[PDB]
Design a protein around this nucleic acid. Structure first.
Ligand SMILES: [Cl-]
Ligand SMILES: [Cl-]
Ligand SMILES: [Cl-]
Ligand SMILES: [Mg+2]
Ligand SMILES: [Mg+2]
Ligand SMILES: [Mg+2]
Ligand SMILES: [Mg+2]
Ligand SMILES: [Mg+2]
Ligand SMILES: [Mg+2]
Ligand SMILES: [Mg+2]
Ligand SMILES: [Mg+2]
Ligand SMILES: [Mg+2]
Ligand SMILES: [Mg+2]
Ligand SMILES: [Mg+2]
Ligand SMILES: [Mg+2]
Ligand code: NA
Ligand code: NA
Ligand code: NA
Ligand code: NA
Ligand code: NA
Ligand code: NA
Ligand code: NA
Ligand code: NA
Ligand code: NA
Ligand code: NA
Ligand code: NA
Ligand code: NA
Ligand code: NA
Ligand code: NA
Ligand code: NA
Ligand code: NA
Ligand code: NA
Ligand code: NA
Ligand SMILES: [Sr+2]
Ligand SMILES: [Sr+2]
Ligand SMILES: [Sr+2]
Ligand SMILES: [Sr+2]
Ligand SMILES: [Sr+2]
Ligand SMILES: [Sr+2]
Ligand SMILES: [Sr+2]
Ligand SMILES: [Sr+2]
Ligand SMILES: [Sr+2]
Ligand SMILES: [Sr+2]
Ligand SMILES: [Sr+2]
Ligand SMILES: [Sr+2]
Ligand SMILES: [Sr+2]
Ligand SMILES: [Sr+2]
Ligand SMILES: [Sr+2]
Ligand SMILES: [Sr+2]
Lengths: 115, 119, 246, 145
RNA sequence: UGUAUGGCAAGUCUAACCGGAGUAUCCGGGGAGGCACAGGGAAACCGACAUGGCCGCAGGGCUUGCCCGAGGGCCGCCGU
RNA sequence: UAUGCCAGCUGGUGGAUUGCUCGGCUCAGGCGCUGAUGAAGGACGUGCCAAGCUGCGAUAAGCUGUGGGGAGCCGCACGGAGGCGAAGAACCACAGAUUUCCGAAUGAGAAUCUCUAACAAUUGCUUCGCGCAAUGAGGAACCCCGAGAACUGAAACAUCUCAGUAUCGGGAGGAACAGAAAACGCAACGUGAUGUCGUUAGUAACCGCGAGUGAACGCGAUACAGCCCAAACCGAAGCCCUCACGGGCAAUGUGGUGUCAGGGCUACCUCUCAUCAGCCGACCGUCUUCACGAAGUCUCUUGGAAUAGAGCGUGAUACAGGGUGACAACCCCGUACUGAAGACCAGUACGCUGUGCGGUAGUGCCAGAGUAGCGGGGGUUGGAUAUCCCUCGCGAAUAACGCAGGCAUCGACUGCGAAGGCUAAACACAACCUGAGACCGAUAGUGAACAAGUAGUGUGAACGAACGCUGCAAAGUACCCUCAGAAGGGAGGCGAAAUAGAGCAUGAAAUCAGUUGGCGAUCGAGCGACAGGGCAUACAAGGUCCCUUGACGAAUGA
């Protein structure tokens, strides 16, 4: 039972997007967020640098932390970002909120899920 | 203390000299203007007007002032016993108003007029 | 954003930028947590006497007389929980920790969210406060801290169409239950919170339901009494600015 | 509603037979009783193993992997920018209560660093030098011999 | 020792205690110290994969079976 | 239909329930010793009438003074009689008077009395005389020094554990104890009296190496404070009693010096603001108590009563709490603000008086013995070879010496001088004062809201209850009838209410009397569930139900 009101909203919006528009990842991300927090993603930068690729939005079904280096000019979208994480990402690319992602890309196209 | 039990306790157990404040009644308009007080310890000489009981509206002379029970006897404010006798109906001074004072005591008159103290 | 400053007559007197903290997203769950903690933290330890019901050499006769093996003293049962005048089995205990911990960050985040809830007119009205106004919180010139008469603060709140909240709070409820016997007979709505900088408003403090506070220490409770976000507040210009770095 | 809250009316509160939840018998003894008889299962075996040296004769090195230093070169602008030069003793946290600072060689080194520490691993040297770097042993660190 | 929820995150939390104050609440300070950030070995002592290969779920892509495939799975390789 | 069954009704019985809280329980702050000048405790007295409680002590619910207070009063406890108070009583604060007997109990003896001047007993001083003094006993626990179990855990049990716990003996204080290194040993170019708090750490260490037991250094804090002798060198330069005279002590050493920044002595430099002794002596703060202290008791309706509803008005540096015939900022006490006193902080801080800090050179002058240390036997500890202590035995050096740094010996190194002494503050408890509460609310909470350690039980040690509520006001029921009648009853009176009439708010169940409905002296027993009939039913809070016929019409189906 998610107690955070905003996490609750995000999930309702992720769903609406997966249902209304063509998005099939949003509903997928929604399902992971509905699961226990321990199962949520805690991803460091070193892992985005290794697997992400330019012009393909990185979707993290959890939170991004600041360990390691990120050189790629990628748009990372996560539920939340650590202070250092967001600062490091914006230096080379762009850290975006999952709620922004949904508004801009409701069809959830050209997106790589990372955990 | 803010605790009800202690409050009621200090009132029901106050020593004689402290019980005077339990027999205080509000002064009339003129009396409030004249002595610069809102109330005063009702004396057995004072005249008073009942403002609350079944005797509300009545005027009378204070006949007795019991400190032990913190209650007073006013002239004509009575009850008829079964044998026909007429006995006083004790009144709480907070349900009464002083309309006239007994200033035969130089000490009370002095206290009433002084700005530093109050009677 | 911007906040219209008002002089002691209720007329506009310029305006300042409403600090960023008031943009902080409302987090009623975190707020309620901070409120729950602060309320628990002032609760006093209690518990029955360690030895109540144990002060007796009562013994059980055992089998033989057609009676249950219950400890008795002078033909009267004692000690055991099922016995009248017996010890309480699992009573309130003094040793118990009745305090709740809270991470400073988590609590500081709640203060900010509570602060922010103040800036939302719909929330404030939802919380229950009665007022006729669009902007909120109510910003006033620092010359408010110099007022003395309570009545003077009244005329000002009437000039701001915000006094109705005090008429909401001008009613004491005589509670149900025995708290009455413990000195908690009455209670009343929580109305306006006045936040200043140097010292709490001695002039406003006695207003029905009003709570006064200073910007350096205004907590989650006065900001969101009972854990409910959005209290109708009035900040003094300097306070408004000082509250920014909380 | 919790589990505890639902126990009223259950009589046994989940303990099975009312003959179960009595004294320590239901536990096979108090504490670790029977750790080598009826309850030997999942218990480190009985016995003594090894020895301990006196604590004041024990040294405690403060270690750090090159990966850590290297990933934070640009961030550590507060430290020498030679033809990058870094005195590890200034990087490692808790480097005073430690007997010395040793650099371990885990990870990569995408830069040319000049490291100063009391000790380095064979892999720490290889990696730093192999990236056009040099390794400097501190005066204290001059114990290797 | 689990779990659910919440904060922060290569970090995290302060303890005693200090200041303030609306004075047991509360605001500020306090990182001593704990746990995590490397392991192996009785000890001396030594000290590791910011990814090299193959499968492949979800998801994405395409010209609609073919690509990319985090997690996961099987190996390599590394420290002792 | 009798005996009777079930449910209800009126009235009891009972005292649950609801509401109420003069009592508890717990937390916090403050404060904190008493006694031979006879305590604490107990006994017996003491009132106009007085049994209990409280007070007091033959001056007996009190006497005196000063201040406060004030028109009343004569305790709990509302009677009767009577008295006291403006000669300022009551009442409160401070100080004083009195203060029986037993009691450490002290002239001697004794179940609270008695017999014929008494510090009994033990001590110090001493005019050697009880002449001057001390001790004794108490206190809620806290504190210090001694003696020291077992149940229990180990699933038995011996070591171990419970535990240095329970309990016992001795003793101090308002706090105790500890304390200015023969320390530490993050081994250092480092720390620097002692407690305590956090941590170090369930780490090191112990252990049928089982179960279990369990530190320290350091660190962060709190509070901070450092000194005095013995001896060397001086050698009566001294101390105590007394108003003085005079006496006592003291060469077996009073007194000066001095105390590891070693000191003494000799020779110089310089100087003291250290120390030690002593005078003065708080601010602030905290706890408690007290003075002062704003604004409605206006209209209408209801009511027995307005603090209620409706209307109108006010204060607020005061909307904490209590009282008052129902819900009160504005009726009364209080509350905010300001101010005053006492106590604690504290004979402290500061200030002051006096004294003299310190340095060089020389000098083997001085520096604590059954000690340091070793062995035998025990206890204790985490202390392991390496804790601490007891007991028996043995037993050293002299600063050019000695001890410590977790096995011994020797060398090096670093640290530090034992076998003499004192020492503020920060910490423990809760008797006592005050405050507080998501604690209990009369079978609860204390055993104890009440006569509570009461009644009562036991030879004794010891054990030990239960009992709270009339009403706004006693208006607590006059008169009359009846009766053996201050009984009870009837009638009557009071009050909103007597089914509020005295263990008197409310008044449940079990259960009782009378009574209503259903059943009932030919009939069978888990007392009922579900169906369907009889009989029974004021309103309200449920409004449906029956029959012809017609419509629809699952499985089934003439
Ligand atoms: Cl990661
Ligand atoms: Cl070891
Ligand atoms: Cl040290
Ligand atoms: Mg006057
Ligand atoms: Mg009990
Ligand atoms: Mg209730
Ligand atoms: Mg005698
Ligand atoms: Mg056993
Ligand atoms: Mg065994
Ligand atoms: Mg032990
Ligand atoms: Mg040590
Ligand atoms: Mg001397
Ligand atoms: Mg032992
Ligand atoms: Mg009781
Ligand atoms: Mg009754
Ligand atoms: Na008892
Ligand atoms: Na506690
Ligand atoms: Na059981
Ligand atoms: Na730290
Ligand atoms: Na019969
Ligand atoms: Na005291
Ligand atoms: Na004596
Ligand atoms: Na009597
Ligand atoms: Na006396
Ligand atoms: Na003598
Ligand atoms: Na056993
Ligand atoms: Na046995
Ligand atoms: Na053992
Ligand atoms: Na250190
Ligand atoms: Na009144
Ligand atoms: Na020995
Ligand atoms: Na040492
Ligand atoms: Na009772
Ligand atoms: Sr009285
Ligand atoms: Sr009385
Ligand atoms: Sr038997
Ligand atoms: Sr179970
Ligand atoms: Sr048992
Ligand atoms: Sr075995
Ligand atoms: Sr540290
Ligand atoms: Sr923190
Ligand atoms: Sr993999
Ligand atoms: Sr010190
Ligand atoms: Sr010595
Ligand atoms: Sr009872
Ligand atoms: Sr007997
Ligand atoms: Sr009658
Ligand atoms: Sr049969
Ligand atoms: Sr058909």
């Amino acid at each position: 039972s998610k107690t955070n009101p905003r996490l609750s909203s995000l999930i309702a919006d992720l769903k609406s997007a997966a249902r209304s528009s063509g998005g099939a990842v949003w509903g997928d991300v929604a399902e992971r967020l509905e699961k226990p927090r321990r199962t949520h993603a805690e991803v460091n930068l070193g892992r985005i640098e290794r697997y992400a690729q330019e012009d393909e939005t990185v979707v993290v079904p959890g939170k991004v932390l600041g360990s390691g280096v990120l050189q790629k000019d990628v748009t990372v979208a996560a539920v939340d970002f650590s202070g250092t994480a967001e600062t490091k990402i914006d230096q080379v690319g762009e850290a975006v909120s999952l709620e922004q992602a949904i508004e801009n890309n409701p069809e959830g196209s050209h997106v790589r899920v990372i955990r | 203390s803010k605790q009800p039990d202690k409050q009621r306790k200090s009132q029901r157990r106050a020593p004689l000299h402290e019980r005077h404040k339990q027999v205080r009644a509000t002064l009339s308009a003129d009396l409030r203007e004249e002595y610069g007080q809102r109330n005063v310890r009702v004396n057995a000489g004072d005249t008073v007007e009942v403002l609350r009981g079944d005797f509300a509206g009545e005027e009378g002379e204070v006949i007795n002032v019991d400190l032990d029970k913190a209650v007073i006897h006013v002239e004509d404010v009575t009850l008829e016993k079964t044998d026909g006798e007429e006995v006083p109906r004790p009144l709480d001074t907070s349900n009464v108003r002083v309309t006239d004072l007994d200033l035969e005591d130089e000490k009370r008159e002095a206290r009433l007029e002084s700005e530093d103290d109050s009677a | 954003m911007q906040a219209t400053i008002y002089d002691l007559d209720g007329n506009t007197d310029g305006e300042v930028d409403l600090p960023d903290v008031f943009e902080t997203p409302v987090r009623s769950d975190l707020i309620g947590k901070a409120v729950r903690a602060a309320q628990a933290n002032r609760k006093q330890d209690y518990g029955s006497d360690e030895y109540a019901g144990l002060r007796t050499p009562a013994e059980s006769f055992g089998s033989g007389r057609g009676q249950a093996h219950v400890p008795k003293q002078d033909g009267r049962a004692r000690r055991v929980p099922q016995a009248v005048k017996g010890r309480s089995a699992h009573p309130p205990k003094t040793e118990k920790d009745r305090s709740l911990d809270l991470n400073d960050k988590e609590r500081q985040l709640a203060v900010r969210s509570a602060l922010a809830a103040t800036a939302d007119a719909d929330l404030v009205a939802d919380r229950g406060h009665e007022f006729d106004r669009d902007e909120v919180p109510v910003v006033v010139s620092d010359d408010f801290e110099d007022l003395v008469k309570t009545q003077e603060v009244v005329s000002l709140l009437e000039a701001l169409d915000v006094h109705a909240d005090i008429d909401r709070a001008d009613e004491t409820k005589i509670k149900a239950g025995q708290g009455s016997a413990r000195g908690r007979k009455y209670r009343r709505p929580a109305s306006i919170l006045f936040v200043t900088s140097d010292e709490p408003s001695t002039a406003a403090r006695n207003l029905a339901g009003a709570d006064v506070a200073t910007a350096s220490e205004v907590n989650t409770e006065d900001l969101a009494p009972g854990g409910a976000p959005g209290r109708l507040t009035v900040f003094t210009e300097s306070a408004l600015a000082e509250v920014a770095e909380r | 509603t919790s589990k505890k809250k639902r126990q009223r009316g259950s009589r046994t509160h989940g303990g099975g037979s009312h003959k179960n939840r009595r004294g320590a018998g239901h536990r096979g003894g108090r504490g670790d009783a029977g750790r080598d008889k009826h309850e030997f299962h999942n218990h480190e075996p009985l016995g003594k193993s090894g020895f301990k040296r006196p604590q004041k004769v024990q040294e405690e090195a403060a270690t750090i992997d090159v990966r850590e230093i290297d990933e934070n070169v640009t961030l550590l602008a507060a430290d020498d920018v030679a033809e990058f030069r870094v005195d590890v003793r200034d990087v490692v946290e808790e480097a005073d209560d430690a007997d010395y600072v040793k650099v371990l060689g885990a990870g990569q080194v995408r830069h040319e660093l000049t490291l100063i520490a009391d000790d380095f691993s064979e892999g720490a040297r290889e990696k730093v030098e192999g990236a056009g770097g040099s390794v400097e042993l501190t005066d204290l660190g001059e114990e290797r011999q």
